[PDB]
Every structure is written in structure tokens, then in C-alpha cells.
Design a protein around this nucleic acid. Structure first.
Ligand SMILES: Nc1ncnc2c1ncn2[C@H]1C[C@H](O)[C@@H](COP(=O)(O)OP(=O)(O)OP(=O)(O)O)O1
Ligand SMILES: [Ca+2]
Ligand SMILES: [K+]
Length: 430
DNA sequence: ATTTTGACGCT
């Protein structure tokens, strides 16, 4: 009891831009705003592959990974914006720069960990302490939380969505103990106030809307974020975890969406996160390893300790292209030309990165996939990255991979290459 | 024939 940790020591948010690439294109082209629309890369093969979908179009069943021709079958009036193409490949620069806009705004409020192009974790513990000092026992008005849901409420003894939201928020605020500055529920509530302010600032200064989760750790904040989308935020309190987890499929928890989550389900014969509480820590370590077992034992109780890392910039800068089916690279000239295209984009982005961020990459990673291999990467080799020069980087990549060619004819390449990948890594300050 | 990314763990 008095010594049992409860994982209530931090306030952590996860901010997720809503359908981000779509919003970037809608800001640029007002004709696309408030319409069913999607972002597509390439156009020749089946109308192009959809990579982002507005919520209006999701209502028709349009999803990412879908071909645009098929999406048009579900949504005949679907509007499309195309990813820019440069040097023969999709170029994501517009979205990376929009991401920087948002991340720099978020960084004014607190330390952020860039989780993806449109996702950041936020460590709010210190900001919440300061705001609590400013408030001086003053109660928190529901007006300060105009887009916040409290997971699990309302409960106990209106048929509209906003009415339910307000009822749950009212119950939560009515129960709060505003006089205890160490109260974890109060701390989460102040965190939610700050996140409302952050999201307002993002929308005012960029036009972009986002959703957010607020809880005591990254996994719960990420889970909370997806409960009420778009353009809303959700507070998941420690006390909400038993009911929330009691029907929560294991695969919905971050890092359990793949093979490990499948093995948890299969070996233990369970379906929901809460069922994990019935195993000892040693049982879980015996099945899943020391690290995973301890992590699951704590996580099914709502407890997780992974820190928000102070990192606003990506650790790697990479460029890749697939060559599916008939397009697989079968000559040496082809392989070298595409290595050159990838290296030119990489040099452009690296030079910009060096000027913006006072750092230099020192390692070049080359990855390839051969036709027939089911794995995404068949081979990975590295060489020194000593000059931001595309011809040198492409020549070096060719040198490290050229011995993979089985073909006895020098001009021909076999087995054909279905993927090329150049990644600059190992940054040092400059 | 999703494609193009990015982070981290194991050995
Ligand atoms: N599998 C993918 N392939 C290519 N691009 C992707 C892929 N997944 C995501 N992206 C890009 C496009 C998205 O706008 C952006 C953010 O991804 P993601 O958060 O999963 O969806 P989303 O922002 O489009 O919608 P949501 O509102 O549900 O968050 O990253
Ligand atoms: Ca998103
Ligand atoms: K996401």
C-alpha cells in the first residue's frame, strides 16, 4: 500500500496533427478545405497511392495504403493533392518544413520529443508546477478546457456528443481537490489546460488542428490521444486505467501492435490489456524476457517510465525508393543513376540541415532489397560520410553494394534490386 | 505495386 508505486510522478502529453499532409495541402489550396480529400504519391499506377485522408473522406471508407482509383470507387467526389516529385521520386520537403513550424511552436511551452513528422511527446511536469503556483488555489473553470474529454466520465446516476463531453468534464471538475498541489489528478488537469493553450497557439500561428492525449506517461498519453479525434484532447487519469484497460485489445498499446503483442495473446490466452494483471512479474519475464516482462507488468497497471527525450530534430536523414515488379533494377547503369538521384536529394537535405542545426552527419548507410526477398531490407552496409557531395556519396554506396551483384555480365545486375536506401546518421556538432 | 520515411533493441 504505502510503498506501491503508482506511476503518477509526471504529466506527459502526446500531440498528433490531424491528417497532417492533408492539412498542409488544404492550407495551401483553399478549394480543398472542408472537403473529402486525400494526398497521393505518384499517379500512373492505379491513380497513385493514398498516404493521408481527410476526415470527410474517411467517412466514405477511404484509407491510407489504398489506391486512388479504388478510393474513387468509394468516394467519387474525392479530391486529391499530389506529393511533389523531384529527381524521379516523391519529395516530402513541404511536410517536413510544416512539421518544423509546429514543433517550434510546441517547444515554446515545454520540452518535446519529436516522435514522427506530425507527432511529439511533451513533458509538462515543470510547466504544471509553475502554473499551479500561479493559480494559488483558484479553481479551474470548464471554460479553460473547451475541447477536453475526461476518459471514463460521465458515469453514474443529453444524447449529443458535446453534451456528454461537458457532463463528464463537469463531474471531473466538481470532484477535483484544488487545494492539494501534489494531487496527480489536479496536475493532469492543469496539464490539459496548458495543452489547450498549446493547441490554440498552433492553430492560430499555422492554421493546423491537432488532437492530444494527457496522462502520466507516454504510452497512456498516446492511447488517450486517439480516443477523441479530430481536433479534441483526452485526459486519461490513473484511476481511469482499470476500466479503460478491461476491454482494451492488447494490440492498441504502443509497441504491442506487432509480433510481441500477438505472442502475449497467444501464449497467455488473453485478449485485453487488463487481463495482464493476473500474472506475476516473474511469469511475464519467463515468457517475454526480463525487459518486456517487467514492462508489461508495470504497463498493465498504467505505469511506464520511458522519459520524454529532449530531441526536437530527427537523428537520421534518409532517402529511399522502391522499384516494384517489372521496374526492378536489372542493369548497373540503372542502379548507379538511382543511387545518384537519392544522393542528390540527400545532399540537398544535409546541406540545409548543416546550416539550420549546426551539425554534420558522419556515417552513410546503404540498404538494398533483392527481388524475391520478403524482408524489407536484404542488405545493409555503411561507409564514411566525409563530404556533402552527391557524386561521392553515390559512388561510395555503389562501392559498398556492388559485390552483391550475382550476374557474370558486368553491365547487368542480378538479382534485380527492388529497393534502394541511403541514410545519413551519426551526427556531430559543427 | 503501398511508398517513404524514422527510432530502437538484439547479438
Ligand atoms: N504509412 C505511411 N506511408 C506514408 N506516409 C505516411 C504513412 N503514415 C503516415 N504518413 C504520413 C502522412 C500523414 O499525414 C502523416 C501523419 O501520419 P498519421 O498520424 O498516421 O496520420 P494522419 O496525420 O494523416 O491522420 P490522423 O488524424 O489520424 O492522425 O505521416
Ligand atoms: Ca496525425
Ligand atoms: K499517428
Amino acid at each position: 500500500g504505502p510503498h506501491m508505486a503508482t506511476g503518477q510522478d509526471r504529466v506527459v502529453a502526446l500531440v498528433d496533427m490531424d491528417c497532417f499532409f492533408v492539412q498542409v495541402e488544404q492550407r495551401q489550396n483553399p478549394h480543398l478545405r472542408n472537403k473529402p480529400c486525400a494526398v497521393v504519391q505518384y499517379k500512373s499506377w492505379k491513380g497513385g497511392g493514398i498516404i493521408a485522408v481527410s476526415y470527410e473522406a474517411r467517412a466514405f471508407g477511404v484509407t491510407r495504403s489504398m489506391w486512388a482509383d479504388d478510393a474513387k470507387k468509394l468516394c467519387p467526389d474525392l479530391l486529391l493533392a499530389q506529393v511533389r516529385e523531384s529527381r524521379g521520386k516523391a519529395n516530402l520537403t513541404k511536410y517536413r518544413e510544416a512539421s518544423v513550424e509546429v514543433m517550434e511552436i510546441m517547444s515554446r511551452f515545454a520540452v518535446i520529443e519529436r516522435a514522427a513528422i506530425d507527432e511529439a511527446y511533451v513533458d509538462l511536469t515543470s510547466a504544471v508546477q509553475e502554473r499551479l503556483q500561479k493559480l494559488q488555489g483558484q479553481p479551474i473553470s470548464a471554460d479553460l478546457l473547451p475541447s477536453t474529454y475526461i476518459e471514463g466520465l460521465p458515469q453514474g446516476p443529453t444524447v449529443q456528443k458535446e453534451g456528454m463531453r461537458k457532463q463528464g468534464l463537469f463531474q471531473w471538475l466538481d470532484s477535483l481537490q484544488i487545494d492539494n498541489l501534489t494531487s496527480p489528478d489536479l496536475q493532469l488537469t492543469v496539464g490539459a489546460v496548458i495543452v489547450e493553450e498549446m493547441r490554440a497557439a498552433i492553430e492560430r500561428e499555422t492554421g493546423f488542428q491537432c488532437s492530444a492525449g494527457i496522462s502520466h506517461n507516454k504510452v497512456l498519453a498516446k492511447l488517450a490521444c486517439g480516443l477523441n479525434k479530430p481536433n479534441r484532447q483526452t485526459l486519461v487519469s490513473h484511476g481511469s486505467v482499470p476500466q479503460l484497460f478491461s476491454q482494451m485489445p492488447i494490440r492498441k498499446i504502443r509497441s504491442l501492435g506487432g509480433k510481441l503483442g500477438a505472442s502475449v495473446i497467444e501464449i497467455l490466452g488473453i485478449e485485453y490489456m487488463g487481463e495482464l494483471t493476473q500474472f506475476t512479474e516473474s511469469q511475464l519475464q519467463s515468457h517475454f524476457g526480463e525487459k518486456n516482462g517487467s514492462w508489461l507488468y508495470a504497463m498493465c497497471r498504467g505505469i511506464e517510465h520511458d522519459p520524454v527525450k529532449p530531441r526536437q530534430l530527427p537523428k537520421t536523414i534518409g532517402c529511399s525508393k522502391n522499384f516494384p515488379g517489372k521496374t526492378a533494377l536489372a542493369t548497373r547503369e540503372q542502379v548507379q543513376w538511382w543511387l545518384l538521384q537519392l544522393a542528390q536529394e540527400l545532399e540537398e537535405r544535409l546541406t540545409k540541415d548543416r546550416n539550420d542545426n549546426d551539425r554534420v552527419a558522419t556515417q552513410l548507410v546503404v540498404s538494398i532489397r533483392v527481388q524475391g526477398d520478403k524482408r524489407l531490407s536484404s542488405l545493409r552496409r555503411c561507409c564514411a560520410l566525409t563530404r556533402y557531395d552527391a557524386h561521392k556519396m553515390s559512388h561510395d554506396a555503389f562501392t559498398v553494394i556492388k559485390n552483391c551483384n550475382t550476374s557474370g555480365i558486368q553491365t547487368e545486375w542480378s538479382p534485380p534490386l527492388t529497393m534502394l536506401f541511403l541514410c545519413a546518421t551519426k551526427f556531430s556538432a559543427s
